[PDB]
Ligand binder design. Structure first.
Ligand SMILES: OC[C@H]1O[C@@H](O)[C@H](O)[C@@H](O[C@@H]2O[C@H]3CO[C@@H]([C@@H]2O)[C@@H]3O)[C@H]1O
Ligand SMILES: OC[C@H]1O[C@@H](O)[C@H](O)[C@@H](O)[C@H]1O
Ligand SMILES: O[C@H]1[C@@H]2OC[C@H](O[C@H]1O)[C@H]2O
Ligand SMILES: [Ca+2]
Ligand SMILES: [Ca+2]
Ligand SMILES: [Ca+2]
Length: 748
């Protein structure tokens, strides 16, 4: 054991730094039962979107002797709210890792983050874009048993330079309430011996955490039917009152009815308006489909037996149907990864009734396999639950139960990425989506973790966009039940870290020649029109270029310091790029679906530069944002006033680890009950915000315990678990919320 901070000297140490937080020392009751001194941390996290502490020693700590060690903290929350801490650990080289956990109120516990050894020793597949551990899980189960709680892996470098640890930071970010905790006994402990079965036998035959019994866990087929039967008894298909046919408000004003979902401002607040003229507000869940419900098993087939992707396809591999596997494929089954295969206590044989829930993926964003067999436990359970009278009948059953669930829960919509077989449900509105993919030219932003950005000035981008919109139009059949269309998702436009980050598309593209790069030519044209002469450009940018043609050879603007004049041109360049994306996209959607709302490209918190946002404001009927935070702080969202566009949250969630999962997700609660409470706080901030016309939750079901095929997300982010059994705390929170969306929003 190596003690760093026990606070028994009664000082707030001068090498801890606090931001929008108050520190003091207090007596409290320690884990062991004795009164100890502790650091009480009162974060002003309601008023400020970033709060916490950072310990920064005089000199970086040298911990290089600790080749198998964890950093421990004792922590508890005080007051009314659980706390999600982010832990950021910085070495002397500017490498940092980020872990996170929930800190409940009540019982104090010990928390640990690995500095070295065990599942860090070989960390991933070698690939920079891999956030997962080498297991293909975003965060693994513990590598030893203890009552202590492992800080959950999020992102960053796994193996820091232990000779120089420069900063340890604990922060509360974008909270809706003030958070207060007590911290004690910050220390280093050598890791105990590694449990070499830690990745062995994780999953039981139902897809659940096999080594943990937890409240609500399924133990036999009979418990699965009894849970099914209690629910099928409660589901009648009656919506909350008094909804109109399209889930709009009966009891409000009645507006113009165009026969399509559209936008209008009511009482100073943006709303949707349903096809019959009633005020509408969108609530619901994303990923109402099976595509993301399979997990890599570790087996592969002969390539000759697997159908290849067509270059024409509008659907990227992550969003494809589950691939039915043929016998000829299955008969060539071989072990590509021992680590994956050993995780499962049960996979079926080819003749077994549940053998149709195998999948094959021909690519993956990340994880230790680039391709391979997968299995959908969720899908298997649908068949366990509902049987298969004719092939795939449990699918029709599921869809019909899903629609009943959504109406019972008071939701007004089926959210993004709803399977298209629900597009004629004709009982609840839905959101449609498409992706523009293909072999058009590309540009780099410096952080394209999911592929290079589109060259939107290349005519082949338009061709592909047109095709994308054609396929959506064919899917939705001009339906009034379609609220509107999302195109794409969190495109990597530019990050807000730095100028080099935000302006990466302009900067990188300026560096290339104009020849063969349509986006470069467009930038060239704009710059030519603003400046006309190479001298005027030379003066603006502080350059010595001999001509426009030298300039068109490509210019390295990386070392130039960003003056105001330079920033205006970066901005103007980013703006024209985004304008062109949104023009092409809007154009295609409008050509095919003249009547439907175009809903944007779903801006993540890490990819909404104001230039791109303002571009979306021009062309999209509704600006969509993804926002994985406790809620919508006023200060982070004040910019909306200047746009005055109706807006929508495409994604958000909160998860916990009390129901078998090893990763709560992006935002963490202390329990199933706390999740539901944290859901209400988020939604409340949506509801109070006069620019938002809806918010969707990501997603319907938990991701597979051993992580989704695509990228290893293994999150407790469902309204239902892998057995298709709903989280009642989530259900109840959604009923409370969905009960007041109209009355509160439009009310007195
Ligand atoms: O001028 C701002 C910079 O000052 C540098 O001296 C400092 O190293 C750098 O800090 C870092 O910021 C992010 C990029 O790499 C990591 C490092 O801690 C961090 O993730 C920056 O603050
Ligand atoms: O490592 C990439 C990650 O960066 C962080 C961000 O909040 C995540 O959303 C993810 O994009
Ligand atoms: O905002 C979060 C979500 O989780 C993965 C991606 O980046 C981070 C995004 O989908
Ligand atoms: Ca103490
Ligand atoms: Ca997937
Ligand atoms: Ca079957």
């Amino acid at each position: 054991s190596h003690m760093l901070f026990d606070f028994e000297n009664d000082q707030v140490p001068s090498n801890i730094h606090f931001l929008n937080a108050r520190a003091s020392i207090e007596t409290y009751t320690g884990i062991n039962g004795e009164p100890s001194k502790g650091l009480k941390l009162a974060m002003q996290s309601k008023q400020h979107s970033y709060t916490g502490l950072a310990i920064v020693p005089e000199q970086p700590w040298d911990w290089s002797e600790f080749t198998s060690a964890s950093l421990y903290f004792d922590i508890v929350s005080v007051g009314d709210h659980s706390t999600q801490f982010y832990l950021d650990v910085t070495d002397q080289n500017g490498a940092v890792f980020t872990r996170s956990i929930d800190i409940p109120v009540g019982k104090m516990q010990s928390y640990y983050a690995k500095l070295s050894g065990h599942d860090l020793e070989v960390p991933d597949s070698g690939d920079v874009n891999d956030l997962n551990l080498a297991s293909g899980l975003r965060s693994n189960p513990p590598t030893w048993t203890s009552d202590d709680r492992q800080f959950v892996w999020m992102w960053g470098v796994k193996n820091l330079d232990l000779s120089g640890i420069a900063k340890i930071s604990l922060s509360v970010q974008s909270a809706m309430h003030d958070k207060t905790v007590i911290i004690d006994n910050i220390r280093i402990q050598p890791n105990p011996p590694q449990d070499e079965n830690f990745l062995v036998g994780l999953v039981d035959e139902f897809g659940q955490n096999a080594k943990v019994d937890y409240k609500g866990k399924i133990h036999s087929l009979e418990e699965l039917h009894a849970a099914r039967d209690v629910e099928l008894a409660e589901l009648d298909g009656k919506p909350m009152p008094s909804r109109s046919k399209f889930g709009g408000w009966l009891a409000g004003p009645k507006l113009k009815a165009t026969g399509y979902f559209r936008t209008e401002k009511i009482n100073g607040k943006w709303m949707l308006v349903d096809p019959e003229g009633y005020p509408y507000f969108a609530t619901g869940l994303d990923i109402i489909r099976l595509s993301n419900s399979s997990t890599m098993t570790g087996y592969d087939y002969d390539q000759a037996t697997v159908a290849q992707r067509s270059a024409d396809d509008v659907t990227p591999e992550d969003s494809k149907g589950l691939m039915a596997v043929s016998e000829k494929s299955f008969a060539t089954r071989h072990l590509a990864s021992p680590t994956r295969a050993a995780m499962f206590n049960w996979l079926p044989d080819y003749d077994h009734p549940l053998a149709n829930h195998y999948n094959y993926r021909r690519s993956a964003h990340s994880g230790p396999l680039k391709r391979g067999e997968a299995y959908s436990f969720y899908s298997a359970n649908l068949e366990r639950k509902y049987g298969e009278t004719y092939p795939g009948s449990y699918l029709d059953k599921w869809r019909e139960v899903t629609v009943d669930r959504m109406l019972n829960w008071g939701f007004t919509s089926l959210g993004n990425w709803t399977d298209p077989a629900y597009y004629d449900n004709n009982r609840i509105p839905f959101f449609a989506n498409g992706w523009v993919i293909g072999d058009f030219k590309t540009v780099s932003s410096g952080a394209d973790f999911w592929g290079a950005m589109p060259d939107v000035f290349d005519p082949e981008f338009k061709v592909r966009a047109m095709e994308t919109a054609r396929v959506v139009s064919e899917e939705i059949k001009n339906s009034p039940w379609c609220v509107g269309v999302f195109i794409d998702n969190q495109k990597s436009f530019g990050r807000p870290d730095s100028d080099k980050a935000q302006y990466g598309i302009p900067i990188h593209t300026l560096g290339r020649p104009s020849e063969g790069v349509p986006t470069r030519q467009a930038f060239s044209k704009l710059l030519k029109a603003k400046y006309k002469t190479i001298a005027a450009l030379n003066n603006a940018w502080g350059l010595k270029l001999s001509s426009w043609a030298e300039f068109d050879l490509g210019v390295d603007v990386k070392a130039l310091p960003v003056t105001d004049t330079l920033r205006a041109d970066y901005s103007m360049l980013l703006s024209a790029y985004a304008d062109q994306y949104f023009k092409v996209v809007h154009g295609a959607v409008e050509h095919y679906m003249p009547n439907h709302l175009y809903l944007g490209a779903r801006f993540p918190d890490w990819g909404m530069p104001m230039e791109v946002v303002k571009a979306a404001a021009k062309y999209a009927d509704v600006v969509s944002y993804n926002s994985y935070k406790e809620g919508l702080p006023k200060q982070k969202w004040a910019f909306l006033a200047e746009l005055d566009k109706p807006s929508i949250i495409g994604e958000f969630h909160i998860g916990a680890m009390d129901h078998g999962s090893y990763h709560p997700g992006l935002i963490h609660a202390a329990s199933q009950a706390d999740r539901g409470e944290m859901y209400k706080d988020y939604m409340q901030s949506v509801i109070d915000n006069p620019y938002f016309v809806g918010a969707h939750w990501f997603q319907y079901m938990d991701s597979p315990l051993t992580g989704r095929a695509y990228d290893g997300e293994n999150y407790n982010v469902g309204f239902v678990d892998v057995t298709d059994t709903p989280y009642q705390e989530m259900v109840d929170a959604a009923k409370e919320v969905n009960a007041k969306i109209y009355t509160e929003r439009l009310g007195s």
